[PDB]
Symmetry: C5
Subunit: 205 residues, 5 copies
């Protein structure tokens, strides 16, 4: 708490805050999902609720420091409201996402930030076939809402969704879960937008 | 990050916020709807729920700059709470509108602002006949709540609601989707009032 | 915009906020209701849901200005948070009232304020007989919570509830809707309180 | 209004907020309840919902003033957020309480404060026998959450619950309703613990 | 109350905010659960709702003080927002935890802090067999969300969950309730994490 108080002051109070990436200084955000449980399936309205962890990672020069000047501190924890965060969001949610975890990020001396919110999400899915052997497939896109591919690019560290914390006695079993970076060119806008596509095939019991 | 900080502070920290339009200095807000899905139909209460993107566009002289002065930044993204926004509301909602996307807008050097919140709206519609071949038509009007057409004029770039992102496997099919500007030279108050009427015709299957 | 910025700064940033009325300087608030729809009837809990606009009007000398001193501005819109508002509330709600419109008010140069929040309200009503030819009668009264008649008085411009914007395809037809000034005395307190009684008789179909 | 603003400035700005009661300077909170309706009874979850008013009264020397020094002002109204309030909490709630009235308090020149929030409360109650003629009895205790009897004392003005505003067409019929101060000493601690027990016997029709 | 104001001002305002523990200056959080009721069991979504109090205890050296310098004050109550708090969270919640008690803590002159918030938690649990004589078992982990064992270790003053406040007329009786410290090693990280595993076996009637 000696040099850690002095470090956080030198980063947040003295210096201004990141106003977000630009075309001249773009940013790459790494995205990884941890599927925990499929909680609800509404066939009357086509809604499916997921509980998942959202791994987000990015790096800013204006967060870097030299450990030898701050008690050999390599990393720290702080409120996610102390730093800038990307506007990563689902394209087809039907309700406001609810947050299940503390909003705290980890900041490392290279300027890399690690932020992993646990969330609950209702989204659009016709769940017809979930009670069959073949199951049913759903998909929901995640990406920046207002920044283009020239300002925020996405990447994944793997095409496989982490299922190592999927709830055992879940009403549903996961057949396949894949997260896949796409580059989307919409008819509305001259700039492309980049998303990671969370695709899940699943079935009952 | 260097020129953008200076730009954001010159625009926001060096002038009081735009107090809004007046009779002498009216404003034109362009409006457009993207129907993503019809999410709920209640024939017992006559409530229908929509998920849509509401595109709002306007231009302010006080938000103009010369890029040459700012490292040739032509546009930037900022929190919607940094800038003035129009009081566009649905005239027949039954529940508070729920925001599904980040509250971020796009400001351009010409002074223009693009703001597209994704939203869930519950409004008044008798869905009787939805299970017929002919379907049922709902309608909901959007406009400024407190500004007359003398301060805020409305406008659409097209009469057709954007259906390019409509849920491929939706519970309902859209038969027609129109967005129409309407002007009341009388609405219980001696003053011209303007709305954009959203008319949606749809049926089950 | 230059003059309006100045008027608002002069009103809101150079004088302490109005501390509300007192016995020595009372206030009269005008109240009117516009019934848009009866959205829910629950005979198992005796709750009825209304959607209405509540019109509130009052005058403060501390909001007066001479137009000549400010570009001939005669009136402007501002956030309701910028001004004092009366604590008018429904007496028999069963759930927190929900606001459906922007919290913005019109201020006029003579010091008059017009504030019209659209709302959804759940209140105590036994709807027994609503499917009868005669119908059922519900009532909810609205008043200040902590200001007596010596500090806040209420009046109405008409005794008839505005039904000109009632949903044409509502589940319920309105047989009569009145709004009446009433003096209430409580056992706890000597001072009388003033409210406005909203009486609505309606039926199905 | 000049004297009021001056008085408010003197109480809330020329001084720090009351840090709360201590063992050297204890405080007595008078508690009284007003039952308005019993709105929900869930026999499967053992939850009952009340709509009631919680009357709290205490007196601070720091809130005293001589009316002669302030143009004869003997009392005023002000947002509950401007002053300290006791942590009177229900001990067996199942859900967060929902506020139904404005949060304004009345402050009298003797330093006394009167604060009466209207609330919807969900609490633990096996309602078995509510349809019988003997009905059912439910109870919920109210007191400080973190202050012992050494810091906050509780007191009632009467043992009868105010039924003068009980909903006339309520689904239920109140057989008895009492509010009783209770003290429980413990062998580990010299500090007593104080609560007011709200006991309601009721039945259908 | 004069001494208390000066104490709180010396500890909070004339001192930098505690930045949380590190590898160098780690922290031990003592954890305890008082179970009040099992309020909901959903067998179609595998969700169980608990209401409980969560006793948190820890000690900062930065919150120590000499009572002799501040009028023999041994402890005081203050908002949980005035001080740093551990990010203890449930690992398998399905909805945001709902706080039922005031967010106030107690700080002792030795620097120790006791924080006991009442809560409603929804978590993943297959309730299959609850209506049987053997009953059913649920488990939920609680621990820091961003800190490892190096920064935060957990402790329990006992291994039995307090059932002395369990609702007597509950829909369910408890068969066993344990709170047991566990040390994990998730594959993502080379550092260990501490958690306390609340395990509850129970049944109807
Ligand atoms: C990820 N985001 C980007 C692409 C679409 C969804 C969001 C919002 C944002 N959308 C848009 O900018 C957008 N959408 N429509 C239908 C338009 C029509 C005309 C002009 C702009 C737009 C950009
Ligand atoms: C966009 N807005 C304008 C047009 C109607 C919808 C909203 C509400 C606003 N309403 C009104 O201003 C309004 N309404 N009633 C019944 C009144 C009676 C007397 C004076 C004013 C009003 C006007
Ligand atoms: C409209 N108002 C609401 C809140 C305060 C003033 C009035 C009267 C009423 N509340 C009262 O103030 C009130 N009620 N009871 C039973 C009391 C007992 C002692 C002192 C005051 C009261 C409700
Ligand atoms: C207001 N309070 C009451 C209700 C819950 C919150 C607080 C905590 C309080 N509990 C106590 O602090 C408590 N209880 N027992 C049996 C003890 C034995 C030794 C030391 C402390 C306690 C109970
Ligand atoms: C369960 N966890 C959460 C809460 C604390 C213990 C652990 C550790 C912590 N972080 C992680 O869970 C975590 N980190 N990375 C890089 C991951 C990659 C894939 C899956 C999970 C993670 C948060
Ligand atoms: C508390 O403070 C007083 C004042 O200085 C001190 O003299 C005394 O030791 C303490 N209390 C007792 C035991 O008198
Ligand atoms: C755009 O502005 C930049 C400022 O660095 C300038 O270097 C550049 O010349 C400008 N564009 C043109 C016309 O080259
Ligand atoms: C307002 O209007 C009057 C009359 O038209 C005009 O003479 C005066 O200059 C105006 N004041 C301002 C500042 O616009
Ligand atoms: C209160 O002020 C008025 C004068 O404005 C006067 O009637 C009265 O004397 C004053 N109070 C007392 C106690 O005199
Ligand atoms: Na009243």
């Amino acid at each position: 708490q000696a040099n850690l108080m002095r470090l956080k002051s030198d980063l947040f109070n003295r210096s201004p805050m990141y106003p977000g990436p630009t075309k001249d200084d773009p940013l790459t955000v790494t995205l990884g999902f941890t599927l925990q449980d499929i909680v609800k399936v509404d066939s009357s309205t086509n809604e499916v609720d997921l509980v998942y962890w959202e791994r987000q990672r990015w790096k800013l020069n204006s967060l870097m420091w030299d450990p030898n000047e701050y008690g050999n501190i390599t990393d720290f924890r702080t409120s996610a409201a102390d730093i800038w965060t990307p506007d990563i969001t689902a394209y087809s949610s039907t309700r406001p996402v609810q947050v299940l975890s503390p909003q705290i990020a980890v900041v490392t001396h290279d300027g890399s930030v690690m932020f992993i919110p646990a969330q609950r999400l209702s989204f659009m899915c016709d769940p017809t076939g979930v009670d069959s052997e073949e199951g049913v497939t759903c998909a929901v896109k995640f990406g920046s809402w207002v920044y283009s591919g020239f300002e925020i690019d996405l990447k994944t560290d793997t095409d496989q969704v982490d299922l190592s914390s999927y709830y055992a006695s879940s009403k549903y079993e996961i057949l396949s879960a894949t997260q896949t970076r796409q580059v989307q060119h919409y008819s509305c806008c001259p700039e492309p937008y980049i998303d990671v596509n969370l695709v899940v095939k699943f079935r009952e019991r």
